[PDB]
Write a protein that binds this ligand. Structure first.
Ligand SMILES: [Mg+2]
Ligand SMILES: [Mg+2]
Ligand SMILES: [Mg+2]
Ligand SMILES: [Mg+2]
Ligand SMILES: [Mg+2]
Ligand SMILES: [Mg+2]
Ligand SMILES: [Mg+2]
Ligand SMILES: [Mg+2]
Ligand SMILES: [Mg+2]
Ligand SMILES: [Mg+2]
Ligand SMILES: [Mg+2]
Ligand SMILES: [Mg+2]
Ligand SMILES: [Mg+2]
Ligand SMILES: [Mg+2]
Ligand SMILES: [Mg+2]
Ligand SMILES: [Mg+2]
Ligand SMILES: [Mg+2]
Ligand SMILES: [Mg+2]
Ligand SMILES: [Mg+2]
Ligand SMILES: [Mg+2]
Lengths: 80, 71, 82, 205, 62, 85
RNA sequence: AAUUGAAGAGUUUGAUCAUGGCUCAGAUUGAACGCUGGCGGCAGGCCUAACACAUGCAAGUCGAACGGUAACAGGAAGAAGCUUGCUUCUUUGCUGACGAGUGGCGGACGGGUGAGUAAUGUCUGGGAAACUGCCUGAUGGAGGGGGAUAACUACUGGAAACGGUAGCUAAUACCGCAUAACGUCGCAAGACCAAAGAGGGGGACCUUCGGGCCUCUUGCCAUCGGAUGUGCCCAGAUGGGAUUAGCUAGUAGGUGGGGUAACGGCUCACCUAGGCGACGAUCCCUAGCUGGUCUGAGAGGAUGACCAGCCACACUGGAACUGAGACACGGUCCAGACUCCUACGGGAGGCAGCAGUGGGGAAUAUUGCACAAUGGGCGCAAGCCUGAUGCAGCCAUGCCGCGUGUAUGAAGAAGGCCUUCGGGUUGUAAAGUACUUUCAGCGGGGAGGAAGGGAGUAAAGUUAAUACCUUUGCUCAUUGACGUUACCCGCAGAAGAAGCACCGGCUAACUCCGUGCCAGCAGCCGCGGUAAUACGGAGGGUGCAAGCGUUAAUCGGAAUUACUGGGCGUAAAGCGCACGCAGGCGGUUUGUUAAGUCAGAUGUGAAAUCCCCGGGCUCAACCUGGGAACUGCAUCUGAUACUGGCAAG
């Protein structure tokens, strides 16, 4: 298997360099509520294969630039 | 004369032109004991088992007095 | 190199070495890779006195580990000669 | 470390004989037991919960001749150990070598027995033991050293000892002056006007 | 800061060296410290017998 | 400072000077190869390339350059000497 | 078996209830101060100035890499004063060894410190693009040449630190050449890369009779593995502030060169116009992090000394060189601040190594011993080095033991104190009389921490060999700083050894006397203006005890920041009121999903600590065996009610 992660796009124009947001629900350390948690990663996709709105699958990888260590693998949903 | 004991450590004899170090100091000799805590002038340093106060010379007692303020 | 040696863990005048493998360069009671027994130069002729995980010693001795002269003597005295 | 002060007075405060003068006659009196532990001893001070709570644990301490810090530790240990912390306090307390030596009758008073333990005048299982607080296990055998086997003290000591109500969890002799802590004493076979929950709750607040 | 000088009688004056202890006086507002008798230039209380540890008075030669 | 392992200082100076002239020279051959690359003179490139290979390779063994640098140099220079030459 | 444990009280009022602050009882401390002070065991000891530093010590070591002789010894290319085989001069590097020099390995370890660092670190968990001395498994190499140089020598400069010219020499120093794959580059064809010798012994055979030659032990080159170490990447967690809301040009990405051990804006040119931020960027302030420590019933709060892991720093700022490793605590260069030496031209240095001084401070130690043990550096080894370490010195700073006696002793002495003058109390306390001798003291004896190394001798271990060399038995001498060790046995004599706080309520413990809103006390309420249990003394008492108080400090009590676990009509508290973005929350049915949630499994969660059961020091503290624990993170695989997503209502 392949340690991977879903998450939608955001920010388009960067030239084979899409950035992906990864929500996650987590319990609050003291008070117990589960709260949202965005996590923005600088992803690489050779030949701009996607764009804003897209729920995308990614995996961790070799360094490609400053804050950019994740490649594009699949895509799921796109249009608006 | 203070009812406190002291522990000898380093010892020096001023030797014309060199502070030579010594480990022992016999009777009939003079020297300076380094590091002794609360020893003022006129005090007797004796054996703790065979304790004695010695005569202690005299303290000339001043003849001139003056007020000083720290500028 | 890695080595098997004694780390002093007793108490003043009542030592208790710990046989343990480590990078020679670390401190004696410092960073170690793995413990492999103990040697209690006291205990008298009681219930225990020494203990050597000889398999693990031998294991490490296999990857080019070396033996501290005092540990060597200890191994060559826990027998394993017949 | 030891107390050292006038011993009957202590008993006089507690309003009981704590056998600090087990010695011989009287069993108290020729003391004026109670009615004046001081100049104002002759009064009826109604004392608070905290007072009796104190007085009671204070009682136990004087009986065995154990001081606060060590006694605290005895309580803390007693606490940790499984079972009614109240009673197994007394267990450690009773298992003290010096106590055992008195309980076996090798010494007239608990204080006397202590002096004995101190003077290397007692051995346990073959081994000599100096310290009064040596914790005695079951099947251990406390015996008097030959060097000082039955001299004046210990004679009279074993003598009036046997004329006292006697133990159960250990068996004495008198010929070889040796005995065996046969087993730990149970709470049933030791008591009187001595409670615990008082002295237990005291160290718990 | 201002500091109390408990005990009966004292030396202490303009250039004395002393030791401040902390501790207020519910009678002198703004006085929030005590002087520690018997440390440095501050002599102990004269002839005091009960509670000499405070007031820095050495045991009267038994 | 007054610890005879100061001879260490004087030794490493000798060392720098040694490493100095060699590593100087090595570089000046790697310079030569690119000279062709820039000039366009396709022959001169292999001429010098094949001239520097022994230097660079040796220097890796001598341990004043250590392995993959020697690798990388001739590696990507190959990748350049025949990209038009 | 194994984190199984939760107390309240005082104080607002004439009194009451509630509210609410303040205060107290507990535990803890790297403490200090005051009074007092016997021992021992284990432990702790500059928390402030990361302030400056005299002096000594803290890194050396190999002659088995090389030329070598200055000293030390023996032997002397061999000799006197004659003291004829005992000497001390003069010569000889012969041998032991060894000053200085080349070389090698180490100096990047060990030890110190907490300045810097709010994330260039740290903790947990993952990851791919890397190098890695010594130790190691494996395959082959180990050919043949060459140019130099310290030392040294002759002149010559300095006060010194340092040297300056000229000439000569050795090597495992250095550089070609040959050799060249399972190595590097390459699609391949092919190109191309290394190194070193040194010792112990020895039959013949041979010899310039130095050795060659044989053998054995080491060392050198190369490559692929291993082991250990390190570099690099991502995610979540890791203080306070919005009276800091905007930040950002190598900024964010791409391409191509260059670069490093390695991935990468690490760098450079060009091109896109991005990148970060209210899920707190930016900017300020404080801070080394964790294991853990203290408190707490827990959840929490507080904290990061001692031990161990990790990071950073080495007078200050900056920089590289050497090297496997450093941008180097006791290295180099440059600048600074400062100090020191000078024969005035010039030189030298950085205790946050150990000890120690000055200074700051309420406050923190000896300019000690030994490498004997453990462990590190070099060495074949012996050995040498080792202020790591093992010990000792100092301080009640703490924890734990023990002692400072034990029994007996009355019309209950005297003295003091109270008293209604009958007495009562101190008080079995004292004295006296029996008794004991721990610990101190004096004398004897005496474990254990020592396992090893050195000679010898016996073993198809070798090899041409009964040599040399390796292993192991056995044998004989021998290796401790602590050290007058622990511990044991003798000997004398109760002998050397009790204080501190408190006694109005909370709060365990009461009177007289002095004093008279004075002198003073006081944590809180409040005592004192003539019978003060509250001030000061005394007698008596209570509590702790070699300590006791006081102060400083954290948690508790405090459900008084309330997640657990609180409140807002009048006690502090509903915005004057509506509309509304972001966010939080969301009726009812089916299917699906499987993020949250749940279940199981595997790695993991360093050791020490805590806890359980044991074991070892006479006990305990302390030390130790094994477990439980580490309530966590990650991954794979499952479960589908609830939550969330998607589809149709
Ligand atoms: Mg004690
Ligand atoms: Mg280099
Ligand atoms: Mg030499
Ligand atoms: Mg700081
Ligand atoms: Mg070649
Ligand atoms: Mg590129
Ligand atoms: Mg490139
Ligand atoms: Mg709380
Ligand atoms: Mg610096
Ligand atoms: Mg230094
Ligand atoms: Mg009387
Ligand atoms: Mg009372
Ligand atoms: Mg009055
Ligand atoms: Mg009073
Ligand atoms: Mg609370
Ligand atoms: Mg409230
Ligand atoms: Mg109001
Ligand atoms: Mg309203
Ligand atoms: Mg659903
Ligand atoms: Mg643990």
């Amino acid at each position: 298997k392949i340690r991977t992660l879903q998450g939608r796009v955001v920010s388009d124009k960067m030239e084979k360099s899409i950035v992906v947001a990864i929500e996650r629900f987590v319990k609050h350390p003291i008070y117990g509520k589960f709260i949202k948690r965005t996590t923005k990663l600088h992803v690489h996709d050779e030949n701009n294969e996607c764009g804003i709105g897209d729920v995308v699958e990614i995996r961790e990888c070799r360094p490609l630039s400053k804050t950019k260590s994740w490649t594009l693998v699949r895509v799921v949903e796109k249009a608006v | 004369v203070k009812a406190a004991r002291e522990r000898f450590g380093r010892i020096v004899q001023m030797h014309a032109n060199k502070r030579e170090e010594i480990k022992e100091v016999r009777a009939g000799d003079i020297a300076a004991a380094i590091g002794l805590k609360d020893v003022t002038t006129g005090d007797t340093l004796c054996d703790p088992d065979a304790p004695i106060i010695l005569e202690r010379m005299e303290f000339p007692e001043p003849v001139i007095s003056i007020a000083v303020e720290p500028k | 190199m890695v080595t098997i040696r004694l780390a002093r863990h007793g108490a003043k005048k009542r030592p208790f070495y710990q046989v343990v493998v480590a990078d020679s360069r670390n401190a004696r009671n410092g960073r170690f890779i793995e413990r492999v027994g103990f040697f209690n130069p006291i205990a008298s002729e009681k219930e225990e006195g020494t203990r050597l995980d000889l398999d693990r010693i031998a294991h490490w001795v296999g990857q080019g580990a070396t033996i501290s002269d005092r540990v060597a003597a200890l191994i060559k005295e826990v027998n394993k000669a017949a | 470390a030891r107390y050292l002060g006038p011993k009957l007075k202590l008993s006089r405060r507690e309003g009981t004989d704590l056998f600090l003068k087990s010695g011989v006659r009287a069993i108290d009196t020729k003391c004026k037991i109670e009615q004046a532990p001081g100049q104002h001893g002759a009064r009826k001070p109604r004392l608070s919960d905290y007072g009796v709570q104190l007085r009671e644990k204070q009682k136990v301490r004087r009986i065995y001749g154990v001081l606060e810090r060590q006694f605290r530790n005895y309580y803390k240990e007693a606490a940790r150990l499984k079972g009614n912390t109240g009673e197994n306090l007394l267990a450690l307390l009773e298992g003290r070598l010096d106590n055992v030596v008195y309980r076996m009758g090798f010494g007239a008073t608990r204080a006397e027995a202590r002096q004995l333990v101190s003077h290397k005048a007692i051995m346990v299982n073959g081994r000599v033991v100096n310290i009064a607080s040596y914790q005695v296990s079951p099947n251990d055998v406390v015996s008097i050293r030959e060097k000082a086997k039955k001299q004046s003290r210990v004679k009279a000591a074993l003598e009036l000892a046997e004329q006292r109500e006697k133990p159960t969890w250990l068996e004495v002799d008198a010929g070889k002056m040796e005995g065996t802590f046969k087993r730990k004493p149970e709470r049933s076979d030791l008591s009187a006007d001595i409670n615990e929950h008082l002295i237990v709750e005291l160290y718990s607040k | 800061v201002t500091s109390y000088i408990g005990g009966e009688g004292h030396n202490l004056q303009e250039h004395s060296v002393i030791l401040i202890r902390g501790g207020r006086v519910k009678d002198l507002p703004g006085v929030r410290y005590h002087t520690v008798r018997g440390a440095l230039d501050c002599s102990g209380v004269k002839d005091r017998k009960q509670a000499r540890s405070k007031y820095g008075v050495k045991r009267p030669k038994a | 400072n007054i610890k005879s392992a100061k001879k260490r200082a004087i030794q490493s100076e000798k060392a720098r000077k040694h490493n100095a002239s060699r590593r100087s020279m090595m570089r000046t051959f790697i310079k030569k190869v690119y000279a062709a690359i820039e000039a366009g003179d396709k022959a001169a490139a292999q001429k010098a390339f094949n001239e520097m290979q022994p230097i660079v390779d040796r220097q890796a063994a001598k341990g004043l350059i250590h392995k993959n640098k020697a690798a990388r140099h001739k590696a990507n220079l190959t990748a350049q000497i025949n990209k038009l030459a």
